[PDB]
Amino acid sequence: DRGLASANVDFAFSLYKQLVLKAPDKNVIFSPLSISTALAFLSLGAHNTTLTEILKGLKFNLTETSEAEIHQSFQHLLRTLNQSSDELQLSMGNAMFVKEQLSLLDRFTEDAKRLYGSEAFATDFQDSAAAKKLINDYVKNGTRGKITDLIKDLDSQTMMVLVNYIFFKAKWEMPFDPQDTHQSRFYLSKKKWVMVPMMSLHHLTIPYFRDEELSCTVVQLNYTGNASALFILPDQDKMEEVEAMLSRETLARWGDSLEFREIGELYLPKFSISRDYNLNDILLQLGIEEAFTSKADLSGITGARNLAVSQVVHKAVLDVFEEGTEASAATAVKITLL
């Protein structure tokens, strides 16, 4: 299948490079699929230039696809990801929290439920602390407690918040033995390091590629199921080069070049990292601008040009350990009257 695949991966790496640009030495963790899905959901309500900019910014080719085909593709992906599974836990949900008095088109609420699985929950944003707790509780529930305070500030004049979450919990195909985890150096720079629990595996046959073009080593560690982790280890002082060359083409070349190798020893830290982002700057850099201004056209939501985006926020957490990985994220689109 993989209809959304090319746009979603182009968007992923465009987003990654912009996130790094803001703080080039910080940890990064985000779900591009959560952000793409939240913005596709937003585009369900958008018209005219507001709509064109969102779909173009999500890296779709608007001369060869329709908005209807895009929404149907997200609907199908959501159904695939949420199907019952015993191998791994994977869940994605969408919701809208809306001021009760705001008139919504029946077409919009019906399409949001049918395509994105989104209910519409009456929310009193004038009681801002209560509205924030409710939205954060929805996200906490969807992420099994891992994304706790997605919404920090919430304007009492907010009219609607669109929310996406993703939850991922998987076991390694080849789990690490905690008896082989030992505190070891992690070099923050060539001459500075800290101590971290370093997991290890011995005589491990996995997909491997030494990339001499980008001075990095790539390995694939599978989960149980159809999911895997691709790990890329740049040589010292080659991280910036690898980052600059990230792209759909580079990812495809890596995948095409992996070959099985019996690794003598693999060392991987046990770690947990978290990041939260205000995505306004990056979305504007990607050309999504009218949705934020007083020219916003979200008239597919209400039937009138009476709404505009105020903020898009994202939070994500990644936890890597001997038995597997837990990762979760959520995206919220805050919308005011116009």
Partner: protein, 34 residues
């Protein structure tokens, strides 16, 4: 003589689904204790 792969400096991690070709999560670890 066998290759050693030692993730003891900054690295990238991409969580992918081979079936849907989705990137679920993208990460750079510059400090596991940051």
């Amino acid at each position: 003589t066998r290759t050693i792969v030692r993730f003891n400096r900054p690295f990238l991690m991409i969580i992918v689904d081979h079936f849907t070709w989705s990137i679920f999560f993208m990460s750079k670890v510059t400090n596991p204790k940051q």
